[PDB]
Amino acid sequence: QAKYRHDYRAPDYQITDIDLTFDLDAQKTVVTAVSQAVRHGASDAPLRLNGEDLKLVSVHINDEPWTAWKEEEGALVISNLPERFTLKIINEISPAANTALEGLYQSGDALCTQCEAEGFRHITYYLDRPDVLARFTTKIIADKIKYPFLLSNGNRVAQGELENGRHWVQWQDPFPKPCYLFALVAGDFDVLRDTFTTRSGREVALELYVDRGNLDRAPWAMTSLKNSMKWDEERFGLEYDLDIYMIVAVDFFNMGAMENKGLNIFNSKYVLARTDTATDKDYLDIERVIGHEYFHNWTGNRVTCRDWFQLSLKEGLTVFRDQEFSSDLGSRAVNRINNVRTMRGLQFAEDASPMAHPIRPDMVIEMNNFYTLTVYEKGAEVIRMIHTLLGEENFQKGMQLYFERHDGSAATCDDFVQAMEDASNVDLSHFRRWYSQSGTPIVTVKDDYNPETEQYTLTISQRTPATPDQAEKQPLHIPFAIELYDNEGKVIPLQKGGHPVNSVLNVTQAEQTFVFDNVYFQPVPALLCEFSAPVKLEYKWSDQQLTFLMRHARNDFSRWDAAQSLLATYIKLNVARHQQGQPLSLPVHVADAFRAVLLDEKIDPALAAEILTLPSVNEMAELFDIIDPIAIAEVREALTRTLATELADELLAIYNANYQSEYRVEHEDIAKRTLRNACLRFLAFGETHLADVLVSKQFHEANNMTDALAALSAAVAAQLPCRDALMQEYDDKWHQNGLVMDKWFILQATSPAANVLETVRGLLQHRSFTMSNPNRIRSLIGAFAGSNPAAFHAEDGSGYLFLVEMLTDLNSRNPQVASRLIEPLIRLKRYDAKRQEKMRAALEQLKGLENLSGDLYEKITKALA
């Protein structure tokens, strides 16, 4: 049932225009689709239309009832057609019965759609493939009282009233598009309207639709949209191309958001915010996602994907764009740090799992299973490597050539690389292998300083371990950025033979040496600067080299990275000790390094905050071949407690110094607050009474949700006396707000308490929880299985049994959310034999489920192989 990239073949038929009519009703919606088709293939080829769960009413060709057709599994095959003709299909669908949230479905009282990857075929029989671009016109007919707003892509070109309290609106989107970009929304909303005038003077009407009563949480998203539009103009020279830009925030949505042309549909978590309900993180995430979907207007919509194996063509590039947007507007160092934590702690884990795949997949069973950390985040790292090799100027020339050549078409990853190569004259032939090879490369570095010749030599090797999907691995073109520092922290000019050498080394062979002369003093190297390539670095650092970099490295990312390498050594040491029943051991000079960060009056608070944020349990897991989740969790707490004790006075001093009476969603303020709360994490583990008072005080005195949640999280993390009271107070105050309660469910699910599973199971009956909402599911069940590996991997196997129960429900209800939740279970080979046995048993139980979804089937099969 798997489909392969190498089987791509141009369509036998194209549809150039489609006129849709929806007679809307939650129980029974009637769809009438009139398509203008043109044959491109053999004259005897039948037209094969994709369709899922549709009730066919009639088929006409040029108004003639058609008798030469047959329905087969997932398709409508029409034979003996003319070269050009008008196809008319009438079918019925039932939005209310759509619990998978794919196609046209119900979200609360509203009706909305999600068509990517292949959801449009759940609406009508069509050429549901992205290389078929048609001009859409959409007429919507519905009850006026229940659905006063009827929206689709483009501009409103017609509207009217009908008998029996019904009305209609017709939309026209002039830009040809693949059907995955089709969108329809119907319902009653509050609307925030604003305007943005492009650089050339185009006035764009901005409209943000939210559920009634949510207007007080819409301004930030609107502000972010305008910021996104302005930034794309300034940085990429791109302007919006339509007259209106609509965004609809819905409560039931499997994805974070969707870039439907001129009518984006967003999961409300990435839209709604006000100071008492949203944290600094929420604000920055809303900025990131609003920008992301907007950036897709060019990288995804004006230039789309030829086939789904090319998904990264738009996702990797658009993620790169949203990272550059966030970085330009805020702290580049903090953004880079956050994105590298995601790569090392989450994406590396995926590349080391049964689901490993190159950013451009070669084999797919269920395409929705490929909207991954790999396709998105590693995809962006690959785009960033191109940027690193070309430089901003040539990168932009590449973007320009890409649009000149492919604007208005469906392209491939190769087309993009070719545009970059042609515009810059930089050979990316070898570089292309990054698109075809899965797994994380390991770069080993050995060095030598020769005082006799004053030369520094780097011997660099690379290798990518085989993965389940590929037995063959080859060397890649790895941009390896370096910087050399003398004893005083000054940069040593890179040169050889009297000629300067670029700091970005081209590591293209299995092994090679790089010689630098005129190195008058033994240098301390900064390697893989700014995480120049998505690889694991193996270099025999001395603790002093690392603390030296923490104090002298020019780029703040290097300082944080050095601290990570320093901590890695001792996290590994102490996990081994834990398995031997021994307590934490840490050399004095290590605690000294963090004390120095706290007392450094010149360091950016933004950087200090990240250095003082210990790697997560998932980040820590990637430092080990075989994961011991319990040892990792206990060591993380022990490390927190030790630093809390050794730095008690300094932590409190910095906590107080960064107090801010005014709350501002401004980067300098966010940095100080992030630092203050980073200190709070440690202070929560100080003398019980002292910690309990400090934490309870912040929760009650907080004038924003960032500080309130930080305090609540600390109470849970340290199991402080005030915990139960604060948690109940939060529940009583916010139970009616799902997005706010999600933070609470996450805290319950990731609690270090011994009875966490019992609590989580009980919360399935909580008034704020429901299996019908993906956000609730992910915040409670997903957080438990994926963010509390220590509890999920309880030795008795209770965690696996719980997940099996939940997946048994979700497999039938919502396969996509079920597939997101099964990920922790497919990582079984990273655990001990006893755990593997229990996890395999759990997977075998799921494998035998009646009506097993393709989504789960694909992952279960790979995990059990």
Catalytic residues: 293
- What CA–CA distance (Å, rounded) separates 720 from 712? 10
End-to-end CA distance of the chain: 17
Nearer to Zn ion, 196 or 376 (CB): 376
For residue 83, CA distances in Å to 11, 12, 50, 77, 222 come to 14, 11, 20, 16, 47
CB closer to Zn ion, 76 vs 375: 375
Residue 296 Cβ vs Zn ion, minimum distance, rounded to whole Å: 5
Q: Check whether 258 is labelled as a binding-site residue.
A: yes
Minimum separation from the CB atom of position 338 to Zn ion (A): 18
- 727 known member of a binding site: no
Instruction: Flag whether 116 is marked binding.
Output: yes
Q: Which is nearer to Zn ion, 181 or 726 (CB)?
A: 181
Q: Which is nearer to Zn ion, 373 or 785 (CB)?
A: 373
Q: How far apart are CA 542 and CA 590, in angstroms?
A: 12
How far apart CA 625 and CA 263 sit, in angstroms, is: 45
Name which of 315 and 483 has its Cβ closer to Zn ion: 315
Q: Which residues have C-beta within 8 Å of that of residue 80, sequence separation ≥ 6?
A: 46, 68
Do β-strands 29-39 and 84-93 pair in parallel, antiparallel, or remain unpaired? antiparallel
Q: Where are the alpha helices (DSSP H) in 667-755?
A: 667-683, 688-701, 705-717, 723-734, 738-749
State the nearest-atom distance from the C-beta of 315 to Zn ion, in Å.
5
CB of 321 to Zn ion, least distance (A): 9
By CB under 5 A, name the binding residues for Zn ion.
315, 318
Q: How far is the CB of 180 from Zn ion (least distance, A)?
A: 12
Smaller CB separation from Zn ion, 254 or 318: 318
Question: Do you know the residue count of the chain?
Answer: 865
Q: d(Cα 329, Cα 188) in Å, to the nearest integer? A: 34
- Chain-centre distance for alpha carbon 407: 26
Residue (301 or 462) nearer to Zn ion, CB: 301
> What is the C-alpha to C-alpha distance for residues 673 and 678, in angstroms, rounded to an integer?
8
Cβ-based burial of 741 (10 A; exposed 0-12, middle 13-18, buried ≥19): buried
Spell out the residues 6+ positions from residue 64 whose beta carbon is closer than 8 angstroms to its own: none
Which residue, 346 or 428, is less far from Zn ion as judged by CB? 346
- For Zn ion, give the closer residue by CB, 315 or 381: 315
Q: Which residue lies nearer to Zn ion by CB, 319 or 691?
A: 319
Three-state SS letters, 318-370: HHHHHHHHHHHHCCHHHHHHHHHHHHHHHHHHHHCCCCCCCCCCCEECCHHHH
Residue 297 CB, nearest approach to Zn ion (Å): 11
Task: Give the CA dihedral 745, 747, 749, 754, nearest 10 degrees.
Answer: -140
**Cα 293 to Cα 232, 265, 396, 404, 428, distances in angstroms:** 12, 9, 20, 22, 28
Q: Is 315 annotated as a binding residue?
A: yes
Going by DSSP bridges, is the β-strand pair 409-411/303-305 parallel, antiparallel, or unpaired? parallel
The 3-state DSSP class for residue 713 equals helix
CB neighbours (10 Å) of residue 636?
A: 21
Residue 584 dihedral angles phi and psi, to the nearest 5°: -55, 140
Q: Which tokens go with 73?
A: 């599994």
256 labeled binding residue: yes
Give 213-255 as a DSSP string: T-GGG-HHHHHHHHHHHHHIIIII-----SSEEEEEEES--SS
Least distance to Zn ion, CB of residue 117, Å: 12
Strand-by-strand arrangement of the 75-78 sheet: 47-50, 75-78, 69-72
CB of 259: closest distance to Zn ion in angstroms?
Answer: 6
* 3-state secondary structure at position 493: coil
Closest to 444 (Cα-Cα) out of 431, 430, 463: 463
Q: What contacts 618, CB < 8 A, 6 or more positions away?
A: 345, 346, 349, 786, 787, 789
In this structure, the strands spanning 134-143 and 13-23 are: parallel
- What's the CA gap between 596 and 231, in Å, rounded? 37
Q: Which is nearer to Zn ion, 303 or 609 (CB)?
A: 303
In angstroms, what is the minimal distance from the CB of 253 to Zn ion?
A: 14
Nearer to Zn ion, 93 or 346 (CB): 346
For the four alpha carbons of 760, 762, 765 and 767, in that order, the dihedral sign comes to negative
Q: How far is the CB of 373 from Zn ion (least distance, A)?
A: 13
Is 296 annotated to bind a ligand? Reply is yes
DSSP state of 299: B
List CB contacts of 392: < 8 A, sequence separation 6 or more.
none
Q: Among 133, 143, 160, 128, which Cα is nearest to 29's?
A: 143
Query: Least distance to Zn ion from the beta carbon of 133, Å?
Result: 19
State in angstroms the smallest separation of the CB of 314 from Zn ion.
6
Taking residue 2's Cβ as centre, other Cβ atoms within 10 Å add up to 10
Cis peptide leading into 117, omega within 30 of 0?
A: yes
Burial class for 374, CB neighbours closer than 10 Å (0-12, 13-18, 19+): buried
Q: Is 806 annotated as a binding residue?
A: no
Q: Which residues are annotated as a binding site?
A: 116, 256-260, 292, 296, 315
Q: Which residues are annotated as a binding site for substrate?
A: 116, 256-260
Q: Which residues are annotated as a binding site for Zn(2+)?
A: 292, 296, 315
